[PDB]
Swiss-Prot record:
Domain RRM: from-to ranges: 16-92
Coiled-coil stretches noted in the UniProt entry, renumbered to this chain: none
Name this polypeptide is given: RNA-binding protein 12
Cellular localisation: Nucleus
Organism, as annotated: Mus musculus (Mouse)
Cysteines paired by S-S bonds: none
Origin superkingdom: Eukaryota
Amino acid sequence: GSSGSSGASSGKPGPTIIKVQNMPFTVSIDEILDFFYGYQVIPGSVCLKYNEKGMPTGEAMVAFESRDEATAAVIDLNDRPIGSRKVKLVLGSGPSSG
């Protein structure tokens, strides 16, 4: 398929990092914080990714102190209609559990 070039990527311990995709340009830091409402989201975690130019690529990353919380939030917020489009949440570590 799409031949993607890579260099070096290895997993690491720590909290549970979640990956958010399928997000419209309207999405903002405020909206994201409110989207994960109820769950304890680590400060400074919310990392928004932008293109080479600087514009929003509709992607964001978050971290969680507890794996149970991350999984629960993802499942409870999995396929949530954000703004005008649905967002996709995926767990970082796995599927292999250490």
